[PDB]
């Protein structure tokens, strides 16, 4: 059975909607499944906010070390790193790190506030040639993931192209590109997702995301041992608001599309 048949069967049994885009950077060939369809990004949008600050840092050498005050009122829901710093400060670099590696919601909101609101993240993405991405809200409401709601969504192909440009391509100057890559590789939340569908020795940098409607996402850059990198985005969402998140489906999808490398 083709790779297309297998994803279709995986999607059907799962009872949800699956979106996959794999780019093989060796020859720019692509494996696509519902890749032009919009999905709620949830926490995968944090990469774009962190990337926007890195871009700023290319022309402002003091920026990443700028300190930001964390107060009890800044805290939203789920703040594993920021709660450790109430009444203190975190630099913009520390916020970038926490947001990506721990998916800290307070850190995300701080970064968006620094940039001037969700619309500035959207403008940064456009500046990269990404015409799909839109961020509309802050944490935690950007995670509602209501079916058919276009707010805070992108498509798997658009997000694959953009993640490729950010980590392996021309989006960021080298020092900032390397920082983004260091952050993604140190991610702590993605063991059960894309990483679980791959050979154990491959190196992966990824950002997970989860939200309502059992929306379960992961976007990853993958460095095989003896091949050029792959970029892989897997988005998955379900029709009932209180559906369980399904990291195992992303892992199942990663295993299907990388069988052959
Ligand atoms: B992200 O990984 O999609 C996250 C979203 C939420 C978290 C905690 C609480 C509410 C939403 S992490």
Domain-wise residue ranges, the chain: 1-261
- Method underlying the structure: neutron
Tell me the C-alpha to C-alpha distance, in Å, between residue 139 and each of 2, 70, 171. Answer: 39, 16, 25
- Name the resolution in angstroms: 2.0
Question: Strand runs (DSSP E) across the chain, as ranges?
Answer: 17-24, 29-33, 39-40, 67-69, 89-91, 153-154, 203-210, 216-223, 230-237
In angstroms, the CA 133 to CA 127 distance is 11
Ligand 1 atom with minimal separation from the 42 CA: 3
- 3-state SS, residue 134: coil
CA separation for the pair 9, 211 (Å, rounded): 24
- C-alpha–C-alpha distance, residues 261 and 258, integer Å: 6
Burial class (CB in 10 A: 0-12, 13-18, 19+), 223: middle
d(CA 106, CA 101): 13
What is the number of the ligand 1 atom nearest to the C-alpha of 77? 9
As assigned by CATH, the class of the 1-261 domain is alpha beta
Residue 82 backbone phi and psi in degrees, to 5:
-65, -35
Residue nearest to atom 11 of ligand 1 (CA): 140
Give the helix/strand (H/E) hosting 185.
helix 174-185
Active site residue ranges: 43
228 Cα: distance to centroid of ligand 1 (angstroms): 32
């Amino acid at each position: 059975n083709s790779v297309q048949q297998q994803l279709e069967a995986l999607e059907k049994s799962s009872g949800g909607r699956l979106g996959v885009a794999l780019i093989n950077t060796a020859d720019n060939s692509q494996i696509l499944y519902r890749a032009d369809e919009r999905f709620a990004m949830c926490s995968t949008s944090k990469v774009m906010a962190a990337a926007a600050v890195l871009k700023q840092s290319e022309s402002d050498k003091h920026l990443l070390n700028q300190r930001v005050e964390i107060k009890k009122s800044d805290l939203v829901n789920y703040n594993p790193i920021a709660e450790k710093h109430v009444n203190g400060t975190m630099t913009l670099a520390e916020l970038g790190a926490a947001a990506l590696q721990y998916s800290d919601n307070t850190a995300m909101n701080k970064l968006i506030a620094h940039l001037g609101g969700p619309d500035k993240v959207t403008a940064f993405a456009r500046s990269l040639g990404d015409e799909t991405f839109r961020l509309d809200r802050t944490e935690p409401t950007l995670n509602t993931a209501i079916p058919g709601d276009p707010r805070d969504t992108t498509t798997p192909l658009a997000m694959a192209q953009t993640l490729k440009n950010l980590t392996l391509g021309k989006a960021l100057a080298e020092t900032q590109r390397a920082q983004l890559v260091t952050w993604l590789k140190g991610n702590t939340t993605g063991s059960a997702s894309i990483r679980a569908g791959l050979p154990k020795s491959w190196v992966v940098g990824d950002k997970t995301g989860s939200g309502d409607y059992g929306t379960t996402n992961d976007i990853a850059v993958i460095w095989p041992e003896n091949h050029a990198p792959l970029v892989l985005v897997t988005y998955f969402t379900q029709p009932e608001q209180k559906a369980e998140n399904r990291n195992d489906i992303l892992a199942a999808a990663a295993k299907i599309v990388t069988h052959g490398f």
